[PDB]
Amino acid sequence: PRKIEEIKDFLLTARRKDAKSVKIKKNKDNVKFKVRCSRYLYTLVITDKEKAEKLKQSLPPGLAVKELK
Amino acid sequence: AKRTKKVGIVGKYGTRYGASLRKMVKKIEISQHAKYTCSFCGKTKMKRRAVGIWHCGSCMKTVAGGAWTYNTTSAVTVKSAIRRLKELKDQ
Amino acid sequence: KNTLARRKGRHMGIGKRKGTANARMPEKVTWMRRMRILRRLLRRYRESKKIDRHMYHSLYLK
Amino acid sequence: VQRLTYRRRLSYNTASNKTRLSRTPGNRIVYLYTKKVGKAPKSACGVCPGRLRGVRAVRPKVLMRLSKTKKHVSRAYGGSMCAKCVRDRIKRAFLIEEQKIVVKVLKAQAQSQK
Amino acid sequence: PGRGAPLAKVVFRDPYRFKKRTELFIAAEGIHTGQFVYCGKKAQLNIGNVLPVGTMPEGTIVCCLEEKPGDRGKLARASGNYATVISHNPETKKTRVKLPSGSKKVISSANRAVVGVVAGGGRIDKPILKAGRAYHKYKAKRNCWPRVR
Amino acid sequence: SSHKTFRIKRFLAKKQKQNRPIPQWIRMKTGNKIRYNSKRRHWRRTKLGL
RNA sequence: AAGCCAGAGGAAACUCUGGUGGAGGUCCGUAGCGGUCCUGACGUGCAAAUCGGUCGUCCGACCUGGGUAUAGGGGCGAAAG
RNA sequence: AGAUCUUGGUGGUAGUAGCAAAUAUUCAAACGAGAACUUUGAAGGCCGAAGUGGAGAAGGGUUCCAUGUGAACAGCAGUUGAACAUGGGUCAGUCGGUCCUGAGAGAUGGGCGAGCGCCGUUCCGAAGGGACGGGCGAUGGCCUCCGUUGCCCUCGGCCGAUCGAAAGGGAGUCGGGUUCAGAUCCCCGAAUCCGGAGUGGCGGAGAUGGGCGCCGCGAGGCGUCCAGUGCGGUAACGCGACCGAUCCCGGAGAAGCCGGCGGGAGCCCCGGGGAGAGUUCUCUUUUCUUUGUGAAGGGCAGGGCGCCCUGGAAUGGGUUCGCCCCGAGAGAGGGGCCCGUGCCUUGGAAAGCGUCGCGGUUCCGGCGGCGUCCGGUGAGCUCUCGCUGGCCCUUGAAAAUCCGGGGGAGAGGGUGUAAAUCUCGCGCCGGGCCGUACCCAUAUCCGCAGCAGGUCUCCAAGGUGAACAGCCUCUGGCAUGUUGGAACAAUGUAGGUAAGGGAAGUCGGCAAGCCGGAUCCGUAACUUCGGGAUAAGGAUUGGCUCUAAGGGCUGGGUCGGUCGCGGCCGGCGCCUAGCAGCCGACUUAGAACUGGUGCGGACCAGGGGAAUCCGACUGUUUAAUUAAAACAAAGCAUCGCGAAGGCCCG
Ligand SMILES: [Mg+2]
Ligand SMILES: [Mg+2]
Ligand SMILES: [Mg+2]
Ligand SMILES: [Mg+2]
Ligand SMILES: [Mg+2]
Ligand SMILES: [Mg+2]
Ligand SMILES: [Mg+2]
Ligand SMILES: [Mg+2]
Ligand SMILES: [Mg+2]
Ligand SMILES: [Mg+2]
Ligand SMILES: [Mg+2]
Ligand SMILES: [Mg+2]
Ligand SMILES: [Mg+2]
Ligand SMILES: [Mg+2]
Ligand SMILES: [Mg+2]
Ligand SMILES: [Mg+2]
Ligand SMILES: [Mg+2]
Ligand SMILES: [Mg+2]
Ligand SMILES: [Mg+2]
Ligand SMILES: [Mg+2]
Ligand SMILES: [Mg+2]
Ligand SMILES: [Mg+2]
Ligand SMILES: [Mg+2]
Ligand SMILES: [Mg+2]
Ligand SMILES: [Mg+2]
Ligand SMILES: [Mg+2]
Ligand SMILES: [Mg+2]
Ligand SMILES: [Mg+2]
Ligand SMILES: [Mg+2]
Ligand SMILES: [Mg+2]
Ligand SMILES: [Mg+2]
Ligand SMILES: [Mg+2]
Ligand SMILES: [Mg+2]
Ligand SMILES: [Mg+2]
Ligand SMILES: [Mg+2]
Ligand SMILES: [Mg+2]
Ligand SMILES: [Mg+2]
Ligand SMILES: [Mg+2]
Ligand SMILES: [Mg+2]
Ligand SMILES: [Mg+2]
Ligand SMILES: [Mg+2]
Ligand SMILES: [Zn+2]
Ligand SMILES: [Zn+2]
């Protein structure tokens, strides 16, 4: 698994052709976005829910946006 | 304190093998496990690796010497004789 | 309960010892602890300027 | 306490059967079969005993899948010979060539003197 | 293993192609790593040099002497041993030498030999002292040691 | 053993297949003269020659 | 055991003492290997050689798996046919 | 009628010997015609982690798993079974084989041989059938240009086929779930190695800057010329790539045994916080259980360095348990590299686990709540990593395979949004064949058998203790070893005790008994000076209450002269005979009190001395009557032999 730090990197690696799905996990203290690419599961951790909601609205269409809860 | 009166290094052999045999092997074991002064680097770090092979730990120089001593009397006299024959050949 | 008594010294005695004194507490381990404790003290005295190099080195050999 | 079993059919404590203890997310202790300890390259000089620096110490067949940089040093003979012996060889080459020039000059002036 | 005399790896240059030739000379006593040895007719008299017995002086001693011209060393190979060059005659190109057994032998003047004594010194001086040490000595040699009368 | 070769496994397979009782209807054949399978083999009584 | 440190005694030569160190086909003794005695048990046995206690050795000429080589007047034998 | 006759059958013996090695069973119930033996529950015990536990190799071959039967078999029985019958069960790129060579085996050439053949393994061989390179052509064809095909030139010693290890070498799979029986193989989820990609999959790198004539307010643009096979650091070396062949060099693969230390982990121990149990006659904030984070990445600790720079050290210094190190560059200061199995993070909590509840889908990876916490110690045990030593007339594999360097034959473009090329990032495709169940042993193997024998390994808790000893216990396992019941005669086998005497017994102290641990003393002759030696001999040993000694961490300021009740410098001070607080292992010594003199209270655990003979010692030996004084041994001595040779095979 690979860890992403910046938001635009996650966006560009989520709009890849081989991105199977995106799983959104809501923890007590952060939100994890896990995009399932061909080789790695890229995880991006966001500590604040307003940025989490902004990213959730900014996710690309046509891709599974499965949520773990 | 002094631990043995006379056996010294062959105290490891106990009462075995005979006093004359232990006395004979004592000098050889002392010379075989002694550390000589390396003639290449000047350090007292030249010690025996195998029989006839003497390695210096400092300058990593390996010399072909005697079985128990670093060099043998026959080897030294022969080297001097060869040097004299060479100086006669040149002269 | 018996460990608490033994830390106070009970059940140690002479008739409770089966191993040799060196088997119960090795001399080398006692010496090893002693050297480390005293070398640490001499070192800490050297960089606290309580002793110089020469007093340290003579005491180190002592 | 919990006792462990081999996970493969090799049942002897051979050099290729070395294991370490691992705790799983399922809270059990298991063997993980370890790879052998790799060695850094030894200097090509053959005289000094230390192993080369800046080179990753892995098993030989792992070097196939490493990057070029992780297998050598940015220097002449780098990744094959040590810096000290490279300096010695540079100095030795230069000085022996200079001695060749010296001998050539000496014999030329000897022939001129004749 | 099984030999009391050390062996010397000597690396030469191939004179006909770009290559390095590694030899396995018997170590003459006194040679050291990083030392240059010289082999040939014009080699100088130094310990470890190899040169034909015909060119050597009348009293030199040699280490790995050829029994016949052309082969490699055959004589005086065991540790501490040496042969002595007694005499020459350039007619018939012959040289008399003395072998470690004390016997004299006439050989061709073209036989090469290493100058000096072979290393390994007085290996037989030390008593073995132990049936175990005799066992370890002959285990590296061959199955001969426990000798039933 | 657990480690076995293909030929050994095939030989054991044939032995296992042929170690079974006769079908019941064989005894009803005309001029049968066979009562049971005399070539039955138990793993503990008789070991295979292999 | 060697090697090493300190102290003391000495006019010297040197000696003595206390530590450290950890050698050895070293000792006691497990597992292992072996097999002394009871001339014990058993002796149509558990066993076509086993069992109990007692024993020898237990860093080495040590114990052991697998792979190999040596075949009958031949092998192999620290040797008892 | 005979032949210790051959084959087959049958008696007495005789309902006899016997079903006695490894402590042990009991109560109730179920099923069932039937229960000492099956199953369940409750007790009492045993193995006691060097197991009667959990898993493998060899071997077995279906014994594995369900259901059924009750003939035979399981030396009593059986409702049970490793029996019998009917069905079922072994899933792989990454676990092995497969590949490599080892000791060795073995063709061909050659030699021998009546001959099947056997000798030999580089030797008496024209032993390379391969190659990016260049040329000559076929333009084979998307005939631009690049791929094939034939020949020639040049280069090319594995110098020898082949086989040989399921424990050696050998790239790369882990976590969770799942079955009646399979899983590192199935499912779920996370990875990873190797191979391929011609038409080139996408990016990034190469690589895209200077000079001059000008235009143009500047900036920025047009033309021409010139570069451009990366860059940084004094250095160790670093950065994401970083053109390059034949050839050469080197490394890894690739190394013994033993000792002592140090780091890390797993386990063990202690102090708390939860959750669930146990005791509660009295006491017990108590006792027990439980209290996760894989591979692979990134970061950071930690360990190591015989790596670098400054500098120049005797009044020598640094330093270890030991050592050892230094003008060939110490100490000190600053760096670099390797390992990183430890911690954090992605994986990750969604899973797992512990508890508390709620639904149904006859046999839901159901649903939900809470929790999965904070610490401390160590000559502890086991792995592992590292450092430093010792020992050797012993020096402790090879080859596949992979890599780095040297060199520069070549190739690439004319300044373009460029080329050759790329060990950089991501993407695409594939990984065939065989093995895989189970037992692995007081019942799945060998010994005629469910045989007290034999049979190679891995893991390893608490107490006592020197201890992987013995004894007791927890996890896990079992039912006492192919039967039970009732009695307690002789004789036995195994184990004890015995007044007084103490070897009078006997061939003979055979057997048994005495001694035994540790502490403090004390130890002779003789000696090869090492030993003898635990010589011999003597005293002590419990319990309880204390005392003393033996460590580690922090903090050692005289203060507003001031504001970033807190600091940047200093007027403003003297722990310097060292204090203050905090924390923590066992060990040793001394004392008092005390018990019916008993205290190594079980377990563990040397009888001793004086001589004689032999063998020096340690070792070995007649598997199955001889373990010895026999053999071996080091030491000593003799003999042959300089290779067309000595000894030996054929
Ligand atoms: Mg972990
Ligand atoms: Mg003999
Ligand atoms: Mg059988
Ligand atoms: Mg011994
Ligand atoms: Mg002993
Ligand atoms: Mg008997
Ligand atoms: Mg006889
Ligand atoms: Mg008749
Ligand atoms: Mg009867
Ligand atoms: Mg009976
Ligand atoms: Mg018990
Ligand atoms: Mg078992
Ligand atoms: Mg079954
Ligand atoms: Mg029966
Ligand atoms: Mg059956
Ligand atoms: Mg060839
Ligand atoms: Mg093969
Ligand atoms: Mg293997
Ligand atoms: Mg299974
Ligand atoms: Mg985790
Ligand atoms: Mg320094
Ligand atoms: Mg949870
Ligand atoms: Mg299995
Ligand atoms: Mg048995
Ligand atoms: Mg049989
Ligand atoms: Mg019984
Ligand atoms: Mg019974
Ligand atoms: Mg049985
Ligand atoms: Mg009496
Ligand atoms: Mg009496
Ligand atoms: Mg009498
Ligand atoms: Mg009498
Ligand atoms: Mg007796
Ligand atoms: Mg005596
Ligand atoms: Mg008392
Ligand atoms: Mg004897
Ligand atoms: Mg004698
Ligand atoms: Mg024997
Ligand atoms: Mg016998
Ligand atoms: Mg006997
Ligand atoms: Mg004699
Ligand atoms: Zn030197
Ligand atoms: Zn070097």
Side-chain angles (χ1 to χ4, degrees):
Chain A
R2 291 287 171 279
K3 180 181 167 60
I4 310 172
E5 294 90 6
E6 45 168 347
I7 310 299
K8 49 177 75 79
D9 193 12
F10 174 85
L11 265 294
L12 67 94
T13 195
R15 70 186 68 258
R16 260 160 63 184
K17 194 191 83 167
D18 60 295
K20 298 180 192 73
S21 59
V22 160
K23 293 181 181 180
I24 303 161
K25 177 75 169 64
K26 285 184 172 289
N27 300 345
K28 195 263 296 176
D29 48 17
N30 52 41
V31 184
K32 306 208 181 160
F33 294 88
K34 317 184 191 200
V35 58
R36 175 67 256 184
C37 277
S38 169
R39 171 176 192 176
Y40 299 122
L41 174 83
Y42 294 89
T43 300
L44 159 75
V45 177
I46 303 177
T47 61
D48 68 315
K49 272 74 187 175
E50 60 269 14
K51 287 278 174 57
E53 279 291 342
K54 173 65 71 71
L55 197 146
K56 178 163 207 156
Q57 308 313 127
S58 192
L59 288 173
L63 172 73
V65 179
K66 180 169 177 65
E67 316 90 3
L68 275 298
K69 316 294 169 54
Chain B
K2 201 176 66 153
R3 297 181 299 243
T4 55
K5 159 176 265 209
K6 83 176 44 176
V7 289
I9 194 182
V10 293
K12 55 163 154 191
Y13 289 137
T15 76
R16 309 181 279 278
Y17 319 124
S20 290
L21 290 199
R22 296 196 308 272
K23 182 179 302 179
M24 196 183 308
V25 71
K26 180 170 164 202
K27 180 261 291 179
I28 285 172
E29 277 170 356
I30 294 174
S31 77
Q32 159 197 346
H33 298 108
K35 275 159 144 177
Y36 297 83
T37 285
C38 181
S39 87
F40 302 90
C41 64
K43 309 197 150 135
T44 319
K45 280 307 291 308
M46 165 83 71
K47 61 185 283 282
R48 207 189 86 158
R49 165 178 287 162
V51 63
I53 295 150
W54 293 82
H55 184 76
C56 183
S58 307
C59 61
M60 301 290 294
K61 203 85 71 167
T62 311
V63 191
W68 329 111
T69 50
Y70 171 63
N71 42 35
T72 68
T73 285
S74 294
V76 180
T77 61
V78 160
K79 179 177 194 334
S80 63
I82 294 302
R83 188 250 297 142
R84 292 194 197 97
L85 289 186
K86 190 184 182 179
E87 78 185 3
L88 290 176
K89 271 178 79 174
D90 168 75
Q91 219 171 23
Chain C
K1 192 170 168 67
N2 285 336
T3 297
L4 276 189
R6 272 167 180 122
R7 297 205 296 179
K8 301 166 84 173
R10 317 292 181 274
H11 323 294
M12 295 324 272
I14 281 291
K16 303 306 252 177
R17 301 182 193 162
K18 300 296 274 299
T20 301
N22 181 63
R24 301 168 50 87
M25 192 56 245
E27 314 165 7
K28 184 174 171 106
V29 175
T30 298
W31 174 262
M32 202 157 58
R33 281 195 201 131
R34 184 137 77 84
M35 284 302 100
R36 290 161 185 197
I37 283 153
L38 292 193
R39 273 147 192 200
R40 187 160 40 235
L41 182 65
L42 288 178
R43 264 184 270 114
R44 293 188 166 134
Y45 275 17
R46 196 195 35 198
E47 291 84 4
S48 76
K49 310 269 175 315
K50 292 167 190 290
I51 61 190
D52 51 15
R53 301 182 303 168
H54 324 288
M55 195 170 281
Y56 168 86
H57 199 90
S58 66
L59 283 168
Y60 192 104
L61 277 296
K62 275 209 183 36
Chain D
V1 305
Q2 194 251 333
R3 279 170 286 186
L4 301 196
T5 54
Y6 276 144
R7 313 170 58 159
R8 299 166 185 177
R9 277 186 209 274
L10 178 50
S11 60
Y12 305 103
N13 193 49
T14 59
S16 81
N17 210 29
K18 296 305 181 173
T19 47
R20 70 184 184 82
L21 262 53
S22 195
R23 185 175 294 168
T24 64
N27 205 16
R28 51 169 58 83
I29 302 297
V30 294
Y31 288 163
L32 267 186
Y33 285 78
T34 59
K35 321 279 203 276
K36 292 192 176 186
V37 173
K39 285 187 179 74
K42 183 169 294 302
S43 187
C45 53
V47 59
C48 63
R51 303 212 172 246
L52 307 174
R53 292 140 298 279
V55 188
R56 191 149 142 77
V58 291
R59 295 313 280 193
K61 281 164 90 190
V62 183
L63 298 160
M64 198 167 48
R65 69 178 176 261
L66 286 191
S67 188
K68 180 67 169 301
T69 296
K70 302 182 223 143
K71 299 182 273 197
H72 81 285
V73 182
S74 291
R75 189 173 55 243
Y77 296 83
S80 183
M81 209 175 295
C82 46
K84 181 249 289 181
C85 289
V86 174
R87 298 188 280 98
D88 284 14
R89 270 159 83 108
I90 294 161
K91 289 195 269 203
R92 182 177 271 113
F94 169 69
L95 289 173
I96 293 180
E97 297 291 338
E98 294 308 305
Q99 192 53 45
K100 281 191 206 314
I101 287 151
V102 173
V103 168
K104 204 173 311 301
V105 162
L106 278 166
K107 74 173 182 63
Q109 82 171 58
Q111 184 166 355
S112 178
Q113 180 59 241
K114 58 174 283 178
Chain E
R3 183 177 297 171
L7 301 194
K9 294 176 183 168
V10 189
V11 164
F12 293 89
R13 268 176 71 229
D14 201 315
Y16 311 110
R17 57 194 66 80
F18 189 64
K19 206 187 283 195
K20 289 297 178 53
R21 302 308 207 173
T22 309
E23 310 296 307
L24 206 52
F25 286 9
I26 297 171
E29 179 154 349
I31 70 154
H32 62 267
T33 50
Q35 173 207 333
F36 298 130
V37 303
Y38 300 82
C39 311
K41 184 154 76 75
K42 311 282 197 52
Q44 303 169 358
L45 272 191
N46 296 114
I47 313 287
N49 281 22
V50 182
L51 72 164
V53 288
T55 62
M56 286 160 167
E58 303 275 328
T60 185
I61 69 165
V62 297
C63 176
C64 202
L65 176 55
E66 283 171 10
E67 198 162 25
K68 289 269 171 50
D71 70 352
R72 328 292 192 92
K74 291 293 157 171
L75 318 163
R77 296 160 53 90
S79 77
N81 278 114
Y82 62 97
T84 316
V85 172
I86 295 158
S87 85
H88 314 291
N89 57 333
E91 61 266 14
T92 70
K93 299 179 291 295
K94 287 298 175 161
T95 293
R96 304 199 177 199
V97 301
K98 197 181 83 186
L99 298 169
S101 77
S103 86
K104 319 304 210 297
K105 205 197 186 145
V106 177
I107 50 168
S108 309
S109 284
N111 298 16
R112 303 170 288 141
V114 177
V115 175
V117 286
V118 59
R123 185 181 26 88
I124 58 160
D125 286 2
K126 188 195 211 178
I128 291 155
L129 281 192
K130 280 174 48 170
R133 287 180 177 177
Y135 159 87
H136 289 305
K137 155 188 190 75
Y138 291 104
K139 179 150 167 98
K141 287 172 160 298
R142 74 202 68 77
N143 180 215
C144 66
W145 165 59
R147 191 81 180 267
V148 179
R149 292 175 283 101
Chain F
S1 45
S2 183
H3 295 153
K4 48 178 68 71
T5 70
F6 182 78
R7 288 176 200 166
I8 298 321
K9 186 161 169 212
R10 194 176 50 170
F11 167 85
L12 299 169
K14 168 169 180 148
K15 290 289 179 174
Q16 161 174 338
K17 288 196 283 191
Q18 72 181 30
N19 184 41
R20 41 150 291 171
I22 68 167
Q24 180 77 258
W25 44 275
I26 296 286
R27 303 224 303 287
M28 302 298 296
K29 299 190 103 148
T30 295
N32 173 223
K33 215 67 181 183
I34 290 189
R35 285 85 185 276
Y36 52 92
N37 188 14
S38 79
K39 304 214 183 162
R40 286 307 290 287
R41 172 198 49 96
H42 197 252
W43 55 275
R44 224 167 188 192
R45 275 69 168 266
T46 302
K47 296 304 200 180
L48 300 162
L50 191 140

